[PDB]
Amino acid sequence: ADGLAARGTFTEQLQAQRDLVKASDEYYQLADKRYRTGVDNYLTLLDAQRSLF
Amino acid sequence: VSKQQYADANAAYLQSKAAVEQARINLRYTKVLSPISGRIGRSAVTEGALVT
């Protein structure tokens, strides 16, 4: 019964984690575009790159 | 630092240099200069005369 509960929960918990990862990746991509246009410095690119992984 | 902040700092520097040139020309007006070379007459005003 504990195994069935873990099976019923982990597939949704990992989906939530994957959505979090892809949201952070879109954040990093927009920050990289904003860096290479020249608006921001390298520090607030590196912090978003850090938050990504 | 970003290129935008460098552009803003360079603009502020050029603007302050234009302001100090605007002050330098007003300092140059306080010692009046002969605009042409030639024979001068007598001075219609002396020391102590307030001019505007």
PDB file of C-alpha atoms in Angstrom:
ATOM      1  CA  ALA A   1       0.000   0.000   0.000  1.00  0.00           C
ATOM      2  CA  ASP A   2       2.921   2.368   0.672  1.00  0.00           C
ATOM      3  CA  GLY A   3       4.371   1.411  -2.705  1.00  0.00           C
ATOM      4  CA  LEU A   4       1.047   2.134  -4.410  1.00  0.00           C
ATOM      5  CA  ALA A   5       0.912   5.530  -2.686  1.00  0.00           C
ATOM      6  CA  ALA A   6       4.443   6.385  -3.845  1.00  0.00           C
ATOM      7  CA  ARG A   7       3.534   5.270  -7.378  1.00  0.00           C
ATOM      8  CA  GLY A   8       0.432   7.466  -7.297  1.00  0.00           C
ATOM      9  CA  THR A   9       2.360  10.519  -6.078  1.00  0.00           C
ATOM     10  CA  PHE A  10       5.811  10.514  -7.711  1.00  0.00           C
ATOM     11  CA  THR A  11       4.629  10.756 -11.326  1.00  0.00           C
ATOM     12  CA  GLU A  12       2.883  14.049 -10.546  1.00  0.00           C
ATOM     13  CA  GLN A  13       5.646  15.351  -8.263  1.00  0.00           C
ATOM     14  CA  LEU A  14       8.218  14.841 -11.022  1.00  0.00           C
ATOM     15  CA  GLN A  15       5.896  16.532 -13.521  1.00  0.00           C
ATOM     16  CA  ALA A  16       5.686  19.556 -11.215  1.00  0.00           C
ATOM     17  CA  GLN A  17       9.486  19.532 -10.944  1.00  0.00           C
ATOM     18  CA  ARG A  18       9.828  19.343 -14.739  1.00  0.00           C
ATOM     19  CA  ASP A  19       7.481  22.308 -15.183  1.00  0.00           C
ATOM     20  CA  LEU A  20       9.567  24.215 -12.620  1.00  0.00           C
ATOM     21  CA  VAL A  21      12.749  23.344 -14.550  1.00  0.00           C
ATOM     22  CA  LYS A  22      11.322  24.499 -17.877  1.00  0.00           C
ATOM     23  CA  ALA A  23       9.998  27.724 -16.340  1.00  0.00           C
ATOM     24  CA  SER A  24      13.496  28.441 -15.018  1.00  0.00           C
ATOM     25  CA  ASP A  25      14.899  27.616 -18.463  1.00  0.00           C
ATOM     26  CA  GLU A  26      12.567  30.101 -20.164  1.00  0.00           C
ATOM     27  CA  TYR A  27      13.636  32.643 -17.529  1.00  0.00           C
ATOM     28  CA  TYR A  28      17.299  31.998 -18.349  1.00  0.00           C
ATOM     29  CA  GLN A  29      16.663  32.250 -22.097  1.00  0.00           C
ATOM     30  CA  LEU A  30      14.902  35.608 -21.775  1.00  0.00           C
ATOM     31  CA  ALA A  31      17.712  36.818 -19.506  1.00  0.00           C
ATOM     32  CA  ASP A  32      20.271  35.698 -22.096  1.00  0.00           C
ATOM     33  CA  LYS A  33      18.482  37.620 -24.846  1.00  0.00           C
ATOM     34  CA  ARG A  34      18.288  40.647 -22.543  1.00  0.00           C
ATOM     35  CA  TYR A  35      22.030  40.313 -21.915  1.00  0.00           C
ATOM     36  CA  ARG A  36      23.047  40.024 -25.554  1.00  0.00           C
ATOM     37  CA  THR A  37      20.954  43.023 -26.548  1.00  0.00           C
ATOM     38  CA  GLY A  38      23.051  44.962 -24.022  1.00  0.00           C
ATOM     39  CA  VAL A  39      20.425  45.879 -21.431  1.00  0.00           C
ATOM     40  CA  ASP A  40      21.814  44.018 -18.419  1.00  0.00           C
ATOM     41  CA  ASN A  41      25.246  43.018 -17.148  1.00  0.00           C
ATOM     42  CA  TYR A  42      26.749  39.556 -16.842  1.00  0.00           C
ATOM     43  CA  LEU A  43      25.949  39.230 -13.119  1.00  0.00           C
ATOM     44  CA  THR A  44      22.177  39.088 -13.489  1.00  0.00           C
ATOM     45  CA  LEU A  45      22.699  36.631 -16.330  1.00  0.00           C
ATOM     46  CA  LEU A  46      24.872  34.405 -14.154  1.00  0.00           C
ATOM     47  CA  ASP A  47      22.395  34.381 -11.272  1.00  0.00           C
ATOM     48  CA  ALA A  48      19.600  33.181 -13.574  1.00  0.00           C
ATOM     49  CA  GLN A  49      21.966  30.596 -15.075  1.00  0.00           C
ATOM     50  CA  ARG A  50      22.697  29.516 -11.497  1.00  0.00           C
ATOM     51  CA  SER A  51      19.006  29.288 -10.569  1.00  0.00           C
ATOM     52  CA  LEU A  52      18.499  27.127 -13.675  1.00  0.00           C
ATOM     53  CA  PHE A  53      20.644  24.193 -12.628  1.00  0.00           C
TER      54      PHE A  53
ATOM     55  CA  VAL B   1      28.356  46.617 -16.272  1.00  0.00           C
ATOM     56  CA  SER B   2      25.946  46.799 -19.189  1.00  0.00           C
ATOM     57  CA  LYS B   3      26.459  48.845 -22.334  1.00  0.00           C
ATOM     58  CA  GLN B   4      23.308  50.826 -21.538  1.00  0.00           C
ATOM     59  CA  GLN B   5      24.642  52.067 -18.201  1.00  0.00           C
ATOM     60  CA  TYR B   6      27.918  52.967 -19.901  1.00  0.00           C
ATOM     61  CA  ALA B   7      25.945  54.936 -22.496  1.00  0.00           C
ATOM     62  CA  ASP B   8      24.058  56.768 -19.744  1.00  0.00           C
ATOM     63  CA  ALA B   9      27.271  57.567 -17.856  1.00  0.00           C
ATOM     64  CA  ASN B  10      28.925  58.829 -21.045  1.00  0.00           C
ATOM     65  CA  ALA B  11      25.882  60.990 -21.800  1.00  0.00           C
ATOM     66  CA  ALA B  12      25.964  62.488 -18.304  1.00  0.00           C
ATOM     67  CA  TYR B  13      29.697  63.156 -18.668  1.00  0.00           C
ATOM     68  CA  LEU B  14      29.243  64.912 -22.018  1.00  0.00           C
ATOM     69  CA  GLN B  15      26.320  66.913 -20.619  1.00  0.00           C
ATOM     70  CA  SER B  16      28.378  68.082 -17.635  1.00  0.00           C
ATOM     71  CA  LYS B  17      31.228  69.010 -19.981  1.00  0.00           C
ATOM     72  CA  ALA B  18      28.794  71.095 -22.034  1.00  0.00           C
ATOM     73  CA  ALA B  19      27.653  72.789 -18.820  1.00  0.00           C
ATOM     74  CA  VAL B  20      31.216  73.615 -17.802  1.00  0.00           C
ATOM     75  CA  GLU B  21      31.798  75.049 -21.287  1.00  0.00           C
ATOM     76  CA  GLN B  22      28.676  77.179 -20.764  1.00  0.00           C
ATOM     77  CA  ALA B  23      30.287  78.439 -17.564  1.00  0.00           C
ATOM     78  CA  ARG B  24      33.688  78.966 -19.216  1.00  0.00           C
ATOM     79  CA  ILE B  25      32.252  81.257 -21.887  1.00  0.00           C
ATOM     80  CA  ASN B  26      30.537  83.356 -19.206  1.00  0.00           C
ATOM     81  CA  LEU B  27      33.893  83.630 -17.473  1.00  0.00           C
ATOM     82  CA  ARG B  28      35.346  84.721 -20.811  1.00  0.00           C
ATOM     83  CA  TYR B  29      32.734  87.475 -21.046  1.00  0.00           C
ATOM     84  CA  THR B  30      33.936  88.987 -17.755  1.00  0.00           C
ATOM     85  CA  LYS B  31      37.186  89.998 -19.439  1.00  0.00           C
ATOM     86  CA  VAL B  32      35.836  91.705 -22.537  1.00  0.00           C
ATOM     87  CA  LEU B  33      37.901  91.299 -25.678  1.00  0.00           C
ATOM     88  CA  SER B  34      38.245  93.596 -28.663  1.00  0.00           C
ATOM     89  CA  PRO B  35      36.242  91.877 -31.421  1.00  0.00           C
ATOM     90  CA  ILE B  36      38.340  93.542 -34.136  1.00  0.00           C
ATOM     91  CA  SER B  37      41.808  95.037 -34.330  1.00  0.00           C
ATOM     92  CA  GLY B  38      42.013  98.784 -34.756  1.00  0.00           C
ATOM     93  CA  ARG B  39      42.415 102.145 -33.100  1.00  0.00           C
ATOM     94  CA  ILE B  40      40.479 102.574 -29.855  1.00  0.00           C
ATOM     95  CA  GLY B  41      38.940 105.815 -28.647  1.00  0.00           C
ATOM     96  CA  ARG B  42      38.657 106.992 -25.060  1.00  0.00           C
ATOM     97  CA  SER B  43      36.759 104.976 -22.486  1.00  0.00           C
ATOM     98  CA  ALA B  44      33.225 106.226 -21.918  1.00  0.00           C
ATOM     99  CA  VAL B  45      33.176 104.525 -18.496  1.00  0.00           C
ATOM    100  CA  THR B  46      35.803 104.208 -15.781  1.00  0.00           C
ATOM    101  CA  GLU B  47      36.379 101.903 -12.825  1.00  0.00           C
ATOM    102  CA  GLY B  48      33.475 101.543 -10.439  1.00  0.00           C
ATOM    103  CA  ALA B  49      30.820 101.901 -13.148  1.00  0.00           C
ATOM    104  CA  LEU B  50      28.195  99.173 -12.872  1.00  0.00           C
ATOM    105  CA  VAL B  51      27.424  97.675 -16.275  1.00  0.00           C
ATOM    106  CA  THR B  52      24.573  95.413 -17.340  1.00  0.00           C
TER     107      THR B  52
END
